[PDB]
Amino acid sequence: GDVEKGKKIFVQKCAQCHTVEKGGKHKTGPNLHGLFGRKTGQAPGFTYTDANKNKGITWKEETLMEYLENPKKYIPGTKMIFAGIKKKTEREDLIAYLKKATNE
Ligand code: HEC
């Protein structure tokens, strides 16, 4: 877990689709300006699939670890064709940064 390291991990992994505040547009992932308490499906001005829509719980680091290790294991019928990430540190490092972004 580290905000500094995580700063450049999110984007290199997956900025092309997604934003944490600004600049990045609704291409193929919503701007994650509020996680960690905010819900699953209910993206601000975006067009998710009904698969994510059906999911109706809090996003949180707990849920994200599962989702980042393997999103297919949680919401597979979802447009996010994301492959995979480190394994076990990831869910701390990426999360370390995003827990900064959506929050301070
Ligand atoms: C473009 C090919 C993507 C990449 C690369 C990543 N994501 Fe993504 N994500 C994408 C879409 C189209 C969606 C919605 C799925 C649907 O049903 O249409 C998502 C969704 C998420 C969510 C959920 C947000 C919500 O509205 O509930 C999260 C938390 C998320 N994605 C995070 C995330 C991260 C951190 C990624 C890299 C590590 C990543 N995504 C890659 C498309 C794409």
Side-chain angles (χ1 to χ4, degrees):
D2 193 321
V3 65
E4 188 182 278
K5 218 185 191 73
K7 192 80 109 178
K8 201 101 295 190
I9 210 187
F10 161 54
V11 302
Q12 285 197 21
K13 289 287 175 217
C14 48
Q16 182 64 102
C17 308
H18 281 277
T19 325
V20 305
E21 196 201 349
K22 274 152 180 157
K25 298 161 206 182
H26 287 282
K27 273 179 159 182
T28 317
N31 173 19
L32 298 139
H33 83 153
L35 236 58
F36 308 113
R38 280 227 163 148
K39 301 173 186 175
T40 41
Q42 281 262 272
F46 179 70
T47 311
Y48 44 69
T49 70
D50 291 69
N52 186 30
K53 190 187 172 182
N54 268 264
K55 206 90 273 189
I57 56 145
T58 185
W59 277 128
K60 244 199 182 182
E61 56 206 300
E62 37 183 318
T63 328
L64 277 145
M65 74 141 176
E66 284 261 34
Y67 189 70
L68 299 177
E69 176 170 61
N70 195 344
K72 300 156 164 173
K73 195 217 179 184
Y74 198 60
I75 321 178
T78 243
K79 200 190 196 182
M80 180 154 151
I81 63 254
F82 182 65
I85 249 180
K86 300 193 280 188
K87 232 191 176 185
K88 185 171 177 291
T89 322
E90 56 103 335
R91 54 145 215 151
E92 222 179 74
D93 284 4
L94 193 128
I95 262 152
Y97 163 69
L98 282 139
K99 284 179 62 162
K100 201 79 194 141
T102 100
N103 173 48
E104 272 286 277

